[PDB]
């Protein structure tokens, strides 16, 4: 019953983001996991098979909104084809993807409370994707 509450994210940098934002890092939280510490290679390795096609996302935003009391982000669109093709490879290697019971991918703006915005839906460009353990430090970057 239940899972592991996630330990690490898959987090994906942009060259340019078209909202104001407070955080100093923003980046889109692609997805969650838990990670046993023998198993980085494993969830390295599949990161690597995705690259191409992650690199390739059209993902684009459009609105604002809260996620929650504090919690300030932006939507993200075109990235659920490859979001659910992640969670299909990570579960037949036994890795724990999304087992988070409210996560959506979303790049957090702000930890405070703002007035929904909505723009243009406007194309994001990929700068840089990578491996983070959850309030710690990341252990694996890609580019290209």
């Given amino acids: 019953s ?16 078209p909202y104001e934002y407070d955080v100093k890092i923003p980046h889109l939280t692609f997805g969650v996991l838990f990670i046993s510490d023998n198993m980085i290679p494993d969830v390295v390795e599949i990161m690597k098979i995705m690259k191409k096609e ?13 996620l929650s009391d504090g919690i ?3 939507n993200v669109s075109g990235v659920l084809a490859t979001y659910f093709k992640m969670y299909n490879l990570f579960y037949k290697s036994q890795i724990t993807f ?22 243009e839906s406007t194309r ?5 994707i990578y491996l983070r353990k959850i309030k710690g430090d990341t252990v694996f970057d890609m580019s290209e």
Avoid: C, W
């Fill in 72 to 74: 300030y982000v932006a």
């Fill in 124 to 128: 994001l460009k990929i700068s840089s």
């Fill in 2 to 17: 239940g899972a592991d509450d996630p330990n690490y994210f898959i987090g994906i940098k942009f060259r340019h983001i």
């Fill in 54 to 66: 992650l690199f390739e996302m059209d993902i684009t935003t459009s609105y604002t909104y809260m």
């Fill in 98 to 119: 999304g087992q988070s019971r409210m996560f959506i991918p979303h790049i957090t703006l702000s930890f405070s409370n703002n007035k929904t915005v909505r723009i």
